[PDB]
mmCIF file of C-alpha atoms and ligand atoms in Angstrom:
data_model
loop_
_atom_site.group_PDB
_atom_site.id
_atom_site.type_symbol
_atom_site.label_atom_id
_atom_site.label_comp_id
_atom_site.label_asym_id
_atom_site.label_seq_id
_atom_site.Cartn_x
_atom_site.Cartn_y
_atom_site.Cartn_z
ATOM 1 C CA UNK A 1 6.570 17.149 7.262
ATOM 2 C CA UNK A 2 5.065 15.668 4.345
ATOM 3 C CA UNK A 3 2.942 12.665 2.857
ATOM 4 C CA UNK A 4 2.263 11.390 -0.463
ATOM 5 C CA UNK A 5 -1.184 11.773 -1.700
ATOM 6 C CA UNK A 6 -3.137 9.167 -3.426
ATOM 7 C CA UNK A 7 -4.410 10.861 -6.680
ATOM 8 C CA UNK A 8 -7.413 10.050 -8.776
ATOM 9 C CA UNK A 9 -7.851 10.672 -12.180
ATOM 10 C CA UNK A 10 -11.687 12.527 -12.986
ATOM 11 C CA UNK A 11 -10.299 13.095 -16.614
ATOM 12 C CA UNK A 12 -8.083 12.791 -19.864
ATOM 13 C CA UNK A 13 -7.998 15.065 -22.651
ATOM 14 C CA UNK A 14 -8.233 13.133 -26.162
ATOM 15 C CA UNK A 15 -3.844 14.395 -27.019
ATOM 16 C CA UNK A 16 -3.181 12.074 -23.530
ATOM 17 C CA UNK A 17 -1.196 15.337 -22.155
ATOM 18 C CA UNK A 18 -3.726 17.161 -20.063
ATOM 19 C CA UNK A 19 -5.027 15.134 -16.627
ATOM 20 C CA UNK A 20 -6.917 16.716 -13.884
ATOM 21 C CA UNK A 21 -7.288 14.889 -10.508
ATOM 22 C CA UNK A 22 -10.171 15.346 -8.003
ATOM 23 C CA UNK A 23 -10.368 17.774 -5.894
ATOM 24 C CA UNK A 24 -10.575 16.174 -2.564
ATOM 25 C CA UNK A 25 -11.962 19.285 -0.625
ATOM 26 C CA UNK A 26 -14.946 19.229 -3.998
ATOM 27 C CA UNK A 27 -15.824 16.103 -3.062
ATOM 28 C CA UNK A 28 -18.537 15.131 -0.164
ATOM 29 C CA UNK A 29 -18.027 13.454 3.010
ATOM 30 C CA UNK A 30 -20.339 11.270 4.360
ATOM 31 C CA UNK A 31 -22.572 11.738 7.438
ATOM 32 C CA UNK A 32 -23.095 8.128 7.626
ATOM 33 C CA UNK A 33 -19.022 7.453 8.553
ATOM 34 C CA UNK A 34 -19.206 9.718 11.578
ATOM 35 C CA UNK A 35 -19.045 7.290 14.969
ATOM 36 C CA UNK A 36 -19.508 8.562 18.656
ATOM 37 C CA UNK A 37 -16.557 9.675 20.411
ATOM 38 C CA UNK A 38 -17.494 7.729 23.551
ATOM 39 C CA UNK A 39 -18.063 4.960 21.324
ATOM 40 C CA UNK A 40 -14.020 4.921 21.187
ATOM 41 C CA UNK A 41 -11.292 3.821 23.618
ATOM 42 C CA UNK A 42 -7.878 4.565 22.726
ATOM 43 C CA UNK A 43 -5.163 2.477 23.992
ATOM 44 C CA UNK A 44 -0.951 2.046 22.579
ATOM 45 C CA UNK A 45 0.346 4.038 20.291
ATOM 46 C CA UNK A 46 1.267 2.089 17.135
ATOM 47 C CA UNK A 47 3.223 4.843 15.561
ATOM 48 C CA UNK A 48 4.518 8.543 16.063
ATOM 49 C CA UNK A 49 5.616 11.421 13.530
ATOM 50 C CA UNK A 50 6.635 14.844 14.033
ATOM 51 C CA UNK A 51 2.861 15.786 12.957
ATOM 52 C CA UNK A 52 0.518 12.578 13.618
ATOM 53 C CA UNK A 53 0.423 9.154 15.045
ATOM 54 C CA UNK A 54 -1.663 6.142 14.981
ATOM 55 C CA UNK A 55 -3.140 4.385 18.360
ATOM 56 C CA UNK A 56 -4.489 1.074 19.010
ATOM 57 C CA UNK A 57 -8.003 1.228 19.625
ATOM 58 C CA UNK A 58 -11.187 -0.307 20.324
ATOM 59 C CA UNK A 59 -14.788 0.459 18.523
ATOM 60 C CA UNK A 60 -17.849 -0.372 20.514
ATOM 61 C CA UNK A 61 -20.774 -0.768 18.512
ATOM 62 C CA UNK A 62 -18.744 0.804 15.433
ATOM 63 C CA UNK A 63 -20.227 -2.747 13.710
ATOM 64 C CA UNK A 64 -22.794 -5.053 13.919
ATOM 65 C CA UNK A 65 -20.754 -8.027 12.910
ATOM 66 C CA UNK A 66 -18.129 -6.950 15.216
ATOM 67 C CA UNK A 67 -19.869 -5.340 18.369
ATOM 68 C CA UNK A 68 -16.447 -4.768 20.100
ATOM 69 C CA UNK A 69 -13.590 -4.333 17.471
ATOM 70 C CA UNK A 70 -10.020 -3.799 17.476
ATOM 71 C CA UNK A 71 -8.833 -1.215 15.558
ATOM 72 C CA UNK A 72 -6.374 1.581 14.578
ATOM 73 C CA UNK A 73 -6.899 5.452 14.626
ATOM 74 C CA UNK A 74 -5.382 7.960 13.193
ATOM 75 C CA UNK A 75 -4.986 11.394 14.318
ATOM 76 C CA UNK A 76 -2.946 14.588 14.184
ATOM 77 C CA UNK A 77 -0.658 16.216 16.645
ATOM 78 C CA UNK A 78 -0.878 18.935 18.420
ATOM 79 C CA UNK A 79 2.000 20.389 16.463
ATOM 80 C CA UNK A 80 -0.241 19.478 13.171
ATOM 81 C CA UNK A 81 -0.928 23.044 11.094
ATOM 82 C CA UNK A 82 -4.243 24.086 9.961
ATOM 83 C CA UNK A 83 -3.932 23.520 6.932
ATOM 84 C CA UNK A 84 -3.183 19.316 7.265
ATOM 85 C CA UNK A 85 -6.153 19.001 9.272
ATOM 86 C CA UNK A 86 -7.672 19.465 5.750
ATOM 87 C CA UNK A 87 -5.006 16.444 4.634
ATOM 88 C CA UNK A 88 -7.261 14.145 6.886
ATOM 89 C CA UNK A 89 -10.355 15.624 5.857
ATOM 90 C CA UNK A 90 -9.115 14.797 2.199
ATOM 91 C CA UNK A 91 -7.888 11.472 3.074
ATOM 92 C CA UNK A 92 -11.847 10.927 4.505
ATOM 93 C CA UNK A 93 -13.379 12.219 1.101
ATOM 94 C CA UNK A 94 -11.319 10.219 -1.275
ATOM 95 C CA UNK A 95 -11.456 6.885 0.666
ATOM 96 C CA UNK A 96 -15.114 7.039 0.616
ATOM 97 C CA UNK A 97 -14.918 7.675 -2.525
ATOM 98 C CA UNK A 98 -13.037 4.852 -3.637
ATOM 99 C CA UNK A 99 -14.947 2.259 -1.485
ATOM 100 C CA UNK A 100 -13.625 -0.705 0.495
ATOM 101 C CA UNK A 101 -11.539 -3.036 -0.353
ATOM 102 C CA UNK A 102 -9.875 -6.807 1.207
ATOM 103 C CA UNK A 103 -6.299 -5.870 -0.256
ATOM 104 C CA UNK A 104 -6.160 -2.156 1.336
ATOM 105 C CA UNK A 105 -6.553 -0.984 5.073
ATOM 106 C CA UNK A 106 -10.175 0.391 5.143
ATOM 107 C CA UNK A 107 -11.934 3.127 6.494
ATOM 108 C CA UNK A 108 -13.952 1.940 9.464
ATOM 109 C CA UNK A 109 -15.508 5.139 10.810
ATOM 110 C CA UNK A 110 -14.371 8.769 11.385
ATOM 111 C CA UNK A 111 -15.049 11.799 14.335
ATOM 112 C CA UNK A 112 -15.133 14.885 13.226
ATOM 113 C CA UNK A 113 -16.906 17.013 15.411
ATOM 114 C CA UNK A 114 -16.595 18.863 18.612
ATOM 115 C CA UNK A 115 -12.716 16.837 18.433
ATOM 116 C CA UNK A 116 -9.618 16.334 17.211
ATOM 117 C CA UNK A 117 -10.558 14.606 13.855
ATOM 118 C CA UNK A 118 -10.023 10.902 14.503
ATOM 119 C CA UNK A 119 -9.879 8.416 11.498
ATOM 120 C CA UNK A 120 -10.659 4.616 12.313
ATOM 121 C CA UNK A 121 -9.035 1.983 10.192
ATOM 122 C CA UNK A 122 -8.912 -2.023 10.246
ATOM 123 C CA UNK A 123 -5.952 -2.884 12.538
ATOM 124 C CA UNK A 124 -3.570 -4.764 11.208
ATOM 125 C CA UNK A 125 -1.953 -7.444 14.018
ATOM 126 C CA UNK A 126 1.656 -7.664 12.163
ATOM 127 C CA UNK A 127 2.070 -4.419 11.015
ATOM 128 C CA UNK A 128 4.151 -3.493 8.318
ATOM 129 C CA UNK A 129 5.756 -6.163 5.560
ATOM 130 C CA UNK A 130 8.644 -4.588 5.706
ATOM 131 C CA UNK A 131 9.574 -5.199 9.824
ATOM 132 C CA UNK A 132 7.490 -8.748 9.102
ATOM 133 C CA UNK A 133 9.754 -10.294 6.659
ATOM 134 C CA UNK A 134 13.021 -9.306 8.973
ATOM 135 C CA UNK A 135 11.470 -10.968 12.122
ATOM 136 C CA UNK A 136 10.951 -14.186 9.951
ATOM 137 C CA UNK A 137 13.897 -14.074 7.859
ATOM 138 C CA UNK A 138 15.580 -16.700 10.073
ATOM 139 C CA UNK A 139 13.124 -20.096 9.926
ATOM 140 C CA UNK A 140 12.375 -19.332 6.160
ATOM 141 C CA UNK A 141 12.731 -22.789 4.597
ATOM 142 C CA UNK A 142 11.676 -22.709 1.073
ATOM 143 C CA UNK A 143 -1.540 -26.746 2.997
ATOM 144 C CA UNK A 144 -3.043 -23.965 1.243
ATOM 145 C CA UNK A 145 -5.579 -23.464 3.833
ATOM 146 C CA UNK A 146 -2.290 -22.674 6.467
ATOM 147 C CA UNK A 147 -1.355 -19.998 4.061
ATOM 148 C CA UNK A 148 -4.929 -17.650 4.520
ATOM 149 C CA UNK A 149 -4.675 -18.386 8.675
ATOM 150 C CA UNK A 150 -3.485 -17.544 11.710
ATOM 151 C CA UNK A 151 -1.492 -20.958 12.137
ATOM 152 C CA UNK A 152 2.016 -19.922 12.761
ATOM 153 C CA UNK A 153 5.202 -21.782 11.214
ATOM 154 C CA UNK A 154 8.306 -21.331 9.163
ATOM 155 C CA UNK A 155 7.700 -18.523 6.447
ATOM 156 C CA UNK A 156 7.283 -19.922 2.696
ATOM 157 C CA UNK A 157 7.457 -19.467 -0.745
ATOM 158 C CA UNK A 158 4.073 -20.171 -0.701
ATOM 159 C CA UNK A 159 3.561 -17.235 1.918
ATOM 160 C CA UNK A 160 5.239 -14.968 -0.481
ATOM 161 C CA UNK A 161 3.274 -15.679 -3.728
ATOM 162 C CA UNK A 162 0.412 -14.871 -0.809
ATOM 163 C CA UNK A 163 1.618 -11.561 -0.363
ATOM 164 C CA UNK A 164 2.407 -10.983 -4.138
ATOM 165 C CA UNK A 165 -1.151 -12.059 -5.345
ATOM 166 C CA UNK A 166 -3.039 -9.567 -2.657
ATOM 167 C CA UNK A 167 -0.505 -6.736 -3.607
ATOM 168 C CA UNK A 168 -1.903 -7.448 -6.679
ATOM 169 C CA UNK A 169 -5.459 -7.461 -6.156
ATOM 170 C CA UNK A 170 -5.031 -4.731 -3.903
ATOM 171 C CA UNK A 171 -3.427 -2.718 -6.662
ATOM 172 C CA UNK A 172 -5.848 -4.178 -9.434
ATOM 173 C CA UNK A 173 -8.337 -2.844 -7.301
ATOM 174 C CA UNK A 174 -6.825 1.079 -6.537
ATOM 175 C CA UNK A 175 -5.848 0.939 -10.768
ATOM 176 C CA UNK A 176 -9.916 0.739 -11.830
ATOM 177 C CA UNK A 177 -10.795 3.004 -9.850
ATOM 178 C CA UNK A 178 -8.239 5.543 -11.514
ATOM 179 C CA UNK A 179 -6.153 6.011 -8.651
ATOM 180 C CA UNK A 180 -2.479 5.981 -8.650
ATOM 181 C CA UNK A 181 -0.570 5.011 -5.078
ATOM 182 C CA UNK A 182 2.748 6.770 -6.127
ATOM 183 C CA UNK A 183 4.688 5.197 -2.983
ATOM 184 C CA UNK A 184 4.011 1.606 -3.264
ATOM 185 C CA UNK A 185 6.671 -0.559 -1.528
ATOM 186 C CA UNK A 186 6.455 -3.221 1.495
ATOM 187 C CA UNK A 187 6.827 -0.387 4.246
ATOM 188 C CA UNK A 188 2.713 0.633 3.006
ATOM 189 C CA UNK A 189 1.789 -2.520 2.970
ATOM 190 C CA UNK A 190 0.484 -4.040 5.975
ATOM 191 C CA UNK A 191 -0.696 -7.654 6.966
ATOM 192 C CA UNK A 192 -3.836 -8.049 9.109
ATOM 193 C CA UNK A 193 -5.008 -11.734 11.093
ATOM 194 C CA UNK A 194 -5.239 -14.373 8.632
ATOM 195 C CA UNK A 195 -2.041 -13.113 6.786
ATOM 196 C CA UNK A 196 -4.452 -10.629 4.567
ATOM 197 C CA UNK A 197 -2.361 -7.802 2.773
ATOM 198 C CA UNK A 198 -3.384 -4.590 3.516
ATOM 199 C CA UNK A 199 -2.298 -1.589 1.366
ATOM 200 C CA UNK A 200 -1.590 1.403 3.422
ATOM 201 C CA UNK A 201 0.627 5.100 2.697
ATOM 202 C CA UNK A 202 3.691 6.550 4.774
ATOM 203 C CA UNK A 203 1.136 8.940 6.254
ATOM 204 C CA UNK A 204 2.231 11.661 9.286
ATOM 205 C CA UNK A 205 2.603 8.672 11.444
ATOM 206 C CA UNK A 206 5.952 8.414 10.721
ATOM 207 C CA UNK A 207 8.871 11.130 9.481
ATOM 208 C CA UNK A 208 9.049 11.367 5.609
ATOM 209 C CA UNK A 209 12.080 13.920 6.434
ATOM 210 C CA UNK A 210 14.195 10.965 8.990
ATOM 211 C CA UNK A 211 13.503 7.959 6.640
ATOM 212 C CA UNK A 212 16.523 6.930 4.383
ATOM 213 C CA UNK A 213 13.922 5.928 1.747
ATOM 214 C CA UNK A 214 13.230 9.356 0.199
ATOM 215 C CA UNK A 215 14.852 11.565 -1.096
ATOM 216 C CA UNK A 216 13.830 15.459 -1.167
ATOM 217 C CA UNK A 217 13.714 17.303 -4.269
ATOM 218 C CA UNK A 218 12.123 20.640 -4.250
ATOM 219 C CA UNK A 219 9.035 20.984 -1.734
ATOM 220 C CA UNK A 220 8.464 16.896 -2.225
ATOM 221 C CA UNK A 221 10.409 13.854 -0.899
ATOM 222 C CA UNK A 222 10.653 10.748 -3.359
ATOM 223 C CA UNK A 223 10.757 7.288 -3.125
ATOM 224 C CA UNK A 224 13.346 7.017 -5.869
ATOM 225 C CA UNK A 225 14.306 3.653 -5.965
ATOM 226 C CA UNK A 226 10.507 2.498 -6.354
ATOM 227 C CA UNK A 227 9.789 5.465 -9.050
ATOM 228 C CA UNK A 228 9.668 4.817 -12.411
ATOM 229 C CA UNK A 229 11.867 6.046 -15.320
ATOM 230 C CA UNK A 230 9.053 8.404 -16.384
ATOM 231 C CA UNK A 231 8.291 9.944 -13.032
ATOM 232 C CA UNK A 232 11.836 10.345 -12.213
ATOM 233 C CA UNK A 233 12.452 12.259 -15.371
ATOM 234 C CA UNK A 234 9.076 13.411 -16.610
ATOM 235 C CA UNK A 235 7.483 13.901 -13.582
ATOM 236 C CA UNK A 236 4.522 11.580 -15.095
ATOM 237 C CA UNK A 237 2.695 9.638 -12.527
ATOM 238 C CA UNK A 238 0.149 6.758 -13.820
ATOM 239 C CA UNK A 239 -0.901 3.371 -12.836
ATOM 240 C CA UNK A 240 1.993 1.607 -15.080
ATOM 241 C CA UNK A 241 4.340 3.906 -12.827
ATOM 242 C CA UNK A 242 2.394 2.231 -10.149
ATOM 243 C CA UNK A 243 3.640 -0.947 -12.105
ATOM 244 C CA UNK A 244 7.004 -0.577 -12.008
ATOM 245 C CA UNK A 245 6.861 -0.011 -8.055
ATOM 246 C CA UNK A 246 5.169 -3.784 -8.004
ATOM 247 C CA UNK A 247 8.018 -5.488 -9.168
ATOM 248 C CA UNK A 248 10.347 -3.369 -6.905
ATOM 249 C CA UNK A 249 8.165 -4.544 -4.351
ATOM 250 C CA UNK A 250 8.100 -7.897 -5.520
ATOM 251 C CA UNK A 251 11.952 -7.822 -5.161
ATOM 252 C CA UNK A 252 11.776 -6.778 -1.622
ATOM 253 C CA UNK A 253 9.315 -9.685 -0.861
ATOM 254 C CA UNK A 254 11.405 -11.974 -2.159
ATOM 255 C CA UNK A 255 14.691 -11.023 -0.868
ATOM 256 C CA UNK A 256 12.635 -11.193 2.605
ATOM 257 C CA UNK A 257 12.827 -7.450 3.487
ATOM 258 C CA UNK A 258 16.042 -6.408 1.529
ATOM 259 C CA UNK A 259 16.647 -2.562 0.184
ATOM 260 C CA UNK A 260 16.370 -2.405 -3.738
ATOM 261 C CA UNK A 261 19.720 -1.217 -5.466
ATOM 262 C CA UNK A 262 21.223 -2.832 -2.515
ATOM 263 C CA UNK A 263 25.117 -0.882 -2.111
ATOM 264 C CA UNK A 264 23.690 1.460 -4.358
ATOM 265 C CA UNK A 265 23.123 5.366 -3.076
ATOM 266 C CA UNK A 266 20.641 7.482 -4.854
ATOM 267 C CA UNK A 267 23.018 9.860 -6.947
ATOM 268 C CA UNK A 268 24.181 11.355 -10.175
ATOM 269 C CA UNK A 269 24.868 8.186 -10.991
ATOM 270 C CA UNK A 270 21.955 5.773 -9.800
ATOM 271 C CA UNK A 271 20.110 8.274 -12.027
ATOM 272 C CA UNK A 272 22.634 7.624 -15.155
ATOM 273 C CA UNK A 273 22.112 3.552 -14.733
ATOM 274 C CA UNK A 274 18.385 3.746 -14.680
ATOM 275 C CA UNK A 275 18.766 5.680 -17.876
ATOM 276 C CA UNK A 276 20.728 3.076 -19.355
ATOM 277 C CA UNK A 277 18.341 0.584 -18.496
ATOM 278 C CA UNK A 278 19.761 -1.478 -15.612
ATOM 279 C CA UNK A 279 17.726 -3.688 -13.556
ATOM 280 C CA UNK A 280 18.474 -5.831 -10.568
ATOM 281 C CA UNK A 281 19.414 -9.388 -10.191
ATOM 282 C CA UNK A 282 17.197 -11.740 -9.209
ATOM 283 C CA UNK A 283 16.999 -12.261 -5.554
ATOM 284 C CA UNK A 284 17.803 -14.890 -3.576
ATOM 285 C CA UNK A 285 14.115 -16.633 -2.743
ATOM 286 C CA UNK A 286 12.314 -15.447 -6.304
ATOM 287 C CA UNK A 287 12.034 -18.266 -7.856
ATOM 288 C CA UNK A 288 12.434 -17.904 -12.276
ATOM 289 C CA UNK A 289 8.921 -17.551 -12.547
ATOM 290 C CA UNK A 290 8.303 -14.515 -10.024
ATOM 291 C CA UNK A 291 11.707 -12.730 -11.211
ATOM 292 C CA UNK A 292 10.277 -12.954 -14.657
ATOM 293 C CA UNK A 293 6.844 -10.700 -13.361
ATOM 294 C CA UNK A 294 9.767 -7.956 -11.881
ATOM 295 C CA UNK A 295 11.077 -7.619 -15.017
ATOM 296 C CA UNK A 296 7.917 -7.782 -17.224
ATOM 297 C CA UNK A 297 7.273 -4.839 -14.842
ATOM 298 C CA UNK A 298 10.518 -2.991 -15.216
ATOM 299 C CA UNK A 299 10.112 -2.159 -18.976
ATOM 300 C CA UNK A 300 11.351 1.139 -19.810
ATOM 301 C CA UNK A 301 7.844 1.714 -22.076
ATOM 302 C CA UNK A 302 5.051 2.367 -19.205
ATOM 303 C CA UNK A 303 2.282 0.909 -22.139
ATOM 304 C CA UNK A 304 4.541 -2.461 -22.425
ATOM 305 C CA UNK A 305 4.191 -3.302 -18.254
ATOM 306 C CA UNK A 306 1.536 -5.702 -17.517
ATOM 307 C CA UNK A 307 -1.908 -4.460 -15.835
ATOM 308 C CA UNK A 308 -2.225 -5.172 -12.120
ATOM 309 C CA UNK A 309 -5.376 -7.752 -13.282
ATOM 310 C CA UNK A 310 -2.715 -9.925 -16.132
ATOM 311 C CA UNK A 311 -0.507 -9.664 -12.844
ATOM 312 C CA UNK A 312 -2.951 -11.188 -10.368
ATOM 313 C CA UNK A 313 -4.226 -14.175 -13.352
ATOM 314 C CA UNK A 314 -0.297 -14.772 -13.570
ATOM 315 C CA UNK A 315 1.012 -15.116 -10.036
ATOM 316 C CA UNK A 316 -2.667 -17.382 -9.568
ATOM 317 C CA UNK A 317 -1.168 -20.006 -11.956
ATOM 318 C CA UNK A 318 1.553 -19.852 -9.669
ATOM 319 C CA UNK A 319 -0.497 -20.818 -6.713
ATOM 320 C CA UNK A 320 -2.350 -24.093 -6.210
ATOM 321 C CA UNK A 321 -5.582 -23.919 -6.970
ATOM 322 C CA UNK A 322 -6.759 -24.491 -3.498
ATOM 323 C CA UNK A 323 -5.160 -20.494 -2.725
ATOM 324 C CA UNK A 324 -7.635 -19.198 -5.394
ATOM 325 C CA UNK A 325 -10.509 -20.594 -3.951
ATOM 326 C CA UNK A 326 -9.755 -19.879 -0.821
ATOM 327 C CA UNK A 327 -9.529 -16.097 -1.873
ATOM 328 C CA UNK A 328 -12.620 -16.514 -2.832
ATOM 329 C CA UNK A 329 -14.639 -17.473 0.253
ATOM 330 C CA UNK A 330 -12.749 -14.306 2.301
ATOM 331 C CA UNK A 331 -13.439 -11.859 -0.488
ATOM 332 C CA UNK A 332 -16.962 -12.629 -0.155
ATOM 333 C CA UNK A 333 -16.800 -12.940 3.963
ATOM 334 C CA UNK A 334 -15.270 -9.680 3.600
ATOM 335 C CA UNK A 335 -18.029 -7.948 1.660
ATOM 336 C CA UNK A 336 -20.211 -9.901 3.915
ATOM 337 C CA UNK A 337 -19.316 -8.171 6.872
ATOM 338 C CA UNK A 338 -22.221 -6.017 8.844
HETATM 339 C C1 LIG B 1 1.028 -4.910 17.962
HETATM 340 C C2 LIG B 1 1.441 -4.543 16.536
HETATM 341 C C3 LIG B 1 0.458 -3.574 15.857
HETATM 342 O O1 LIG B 1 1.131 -2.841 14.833
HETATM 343 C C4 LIG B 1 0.380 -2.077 13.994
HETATM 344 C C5 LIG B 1 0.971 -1.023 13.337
HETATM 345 C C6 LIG B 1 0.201 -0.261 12.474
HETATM 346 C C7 LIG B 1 -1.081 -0.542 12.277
HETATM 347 C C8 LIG B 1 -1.646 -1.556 12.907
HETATM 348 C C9 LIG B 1 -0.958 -2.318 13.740
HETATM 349 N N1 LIG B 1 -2.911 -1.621 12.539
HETATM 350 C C10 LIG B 1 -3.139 -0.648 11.683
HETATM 351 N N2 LIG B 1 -2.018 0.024 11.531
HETATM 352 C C11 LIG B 1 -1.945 1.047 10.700
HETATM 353 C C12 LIG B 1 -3.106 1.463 10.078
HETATM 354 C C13 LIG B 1 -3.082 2.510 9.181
HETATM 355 C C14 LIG B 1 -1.871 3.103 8.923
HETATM 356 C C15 LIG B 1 -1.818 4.149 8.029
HETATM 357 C C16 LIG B 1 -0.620 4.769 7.749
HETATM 358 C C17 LIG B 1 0.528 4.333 8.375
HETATM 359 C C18 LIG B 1 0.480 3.282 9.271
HETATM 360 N N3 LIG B 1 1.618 2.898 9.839
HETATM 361 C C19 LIG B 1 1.998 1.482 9.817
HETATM 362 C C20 LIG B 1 2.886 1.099 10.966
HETATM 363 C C21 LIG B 1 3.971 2.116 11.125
HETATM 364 N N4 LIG B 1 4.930 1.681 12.137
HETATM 365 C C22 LIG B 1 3.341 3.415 11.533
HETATM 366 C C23 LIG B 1 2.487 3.930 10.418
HETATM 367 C C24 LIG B 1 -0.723 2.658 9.550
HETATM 368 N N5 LIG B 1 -0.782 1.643 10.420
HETATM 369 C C25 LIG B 1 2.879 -4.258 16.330
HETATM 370 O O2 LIG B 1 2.671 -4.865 15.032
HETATM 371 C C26 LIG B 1 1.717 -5.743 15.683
HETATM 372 CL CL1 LIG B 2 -4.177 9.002 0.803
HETATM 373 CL CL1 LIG B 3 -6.559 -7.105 24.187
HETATM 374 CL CL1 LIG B 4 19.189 -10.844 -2.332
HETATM 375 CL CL1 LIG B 5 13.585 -21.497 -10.101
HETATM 376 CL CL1 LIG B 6 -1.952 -6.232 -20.035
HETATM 377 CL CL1 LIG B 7 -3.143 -0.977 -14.437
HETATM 378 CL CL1 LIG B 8 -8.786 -11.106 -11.074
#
């Protein structure tokens, strides 16, 4: 019944106590975004919620470099309420606002009128990390140019400093533009062809209220074993909360699609050990050097966690330099394309 909204940060007053966020219905859509119905063939669906789902698709003429393109849409059911067709509508205005970037699923086009609102996204051939990491758990033994392809063999370590480096970047990205995720964690994170990271939300695709990772308080549902101490207890939300949900999702990358707090329930007393400061053991495939960035991440003071750009320059030492410059030459095909 719910979804966690991205929020953006217009301002902060000089004490550091009063933030306002946009106002996603204040800001402008775009005119340019809008793409011919008929221009659209739906196919699978790729996921269904109580309120939305998100279908396989193909865009013709949608862009130049890719005349025919495969792609995902999202739309709302019919059981959707008037007022969440203004959640898409929002979700339209603030990712326009915040551009396009490699490390997050991107807004391809959108149809808005005389329909059912239709968003069009990058599709993303192997879906979520999450279901990802469990299909390749078995064959994980623990060059460069094999990591940022198609070519399919045993998952790596290598692989997984891969995934950790475009979390990253994807994050580093979302954190200068001012905008806080506030549910990262491997299920929002998708990979596309070429095993590029895509950062993505729970959406209405999927049941908030039949998913054993949140937990409802009040008239919201949160991810509590991602959320850090602050948010938990003072409700504070910032992009060093944001922090703190990278090394969690570090942990789950490198236990290869393992629960956080593992035997651990969210209760009374989950709440108590956080308090007290406990953190989780290293996992089984983090090597010292990665366990050390989860726990650099895990400070209890928000202004002592790294930024998501000292996180990306530390997991690239941690990569051959071949990985980096590979990075390189996709970033720039991606900004290439159309
Ligand atoms: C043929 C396969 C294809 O799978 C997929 C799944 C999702 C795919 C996809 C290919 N391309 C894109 N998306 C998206 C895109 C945006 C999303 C925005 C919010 C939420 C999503 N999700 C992620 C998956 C979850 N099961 C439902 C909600 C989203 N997904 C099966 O994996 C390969
Ligand atoms: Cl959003
Ligand atoms: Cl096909
Ligand atoms: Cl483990
Ligand atoms: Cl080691
Ligand atoms: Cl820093
Ligand atoms: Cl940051
Ligand atoms: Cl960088």
């Amino acid at each position: 019944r719910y979804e966690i909204r991205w929020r953006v940060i217009e301002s902060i007053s000089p004490d550091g106590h009063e933030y306002i966020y946009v106002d996603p219905m204040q800001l402008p859509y775009d005119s340019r975004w809008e793409f011919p119905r008929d221009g659209l063939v739906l196919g699978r669906v790729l996921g269904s919620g109580a309120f939305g789902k998100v279908v396989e698709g193909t865009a013709y003429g949608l862009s130049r470099s890719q005349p025919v393109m495969k792609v995902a849409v999202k739309m709302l059911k019919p059981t959707a309420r008037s007022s969440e067709k203004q959640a898409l509508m929002s979700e339209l205005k603030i990712m326009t606002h915040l551009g396009p970037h490699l490390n997050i699923v991107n807004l391809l086009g959108a149809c808005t009128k005389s329909g059912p609102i239709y968003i069009i996204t990058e599709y993303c051939f192997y879906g979520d990390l999450v279901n990802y990491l469990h299909k390749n758990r078995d064959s994980f033994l623990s060059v460069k140019n094999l990591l940022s392809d198609d070519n399919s063999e045993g998952l790596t370590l290598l692989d997984l400093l891969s995934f950790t480096y475009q979390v990253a970047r994807g994050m580093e990205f979302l954190a200068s533009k001012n905008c806080v995720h506030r549910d990262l964690a491997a299920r929002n994170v998708l990979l596309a062809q070429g095993k590029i990271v895509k950062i993505c939300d729970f959406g209405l695709a999927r049941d908030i209220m039949h998913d054993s990772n949140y937990v409802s308080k009040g008239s919201t549902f949160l991810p509590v074993k991602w959320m850090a101490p602050e948010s938990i207890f003072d409700n504070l939300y910032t992009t060093l909360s944001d922090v703190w949900s990278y090394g969690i999702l570090l942990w789950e990358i490198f236990s290869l699609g393992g629960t956080p707090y593992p035997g651990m329930m969210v209760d009374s007393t989950f709440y108590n050990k956080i308090k007290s400061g406990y953190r989780m053991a290293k996992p089984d495939h983090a090597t010292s050097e990665v366990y050390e960035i989860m726990v650099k991440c895990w400070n209890s003071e928000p202004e002592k966690r790294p930024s998501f750009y000292h996180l990306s320059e530390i997991v690239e030492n941690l990569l051959p330099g071949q990985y980096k410059k590979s990075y390189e030459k996709i970033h720039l095909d991606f900004l290439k394309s159309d």
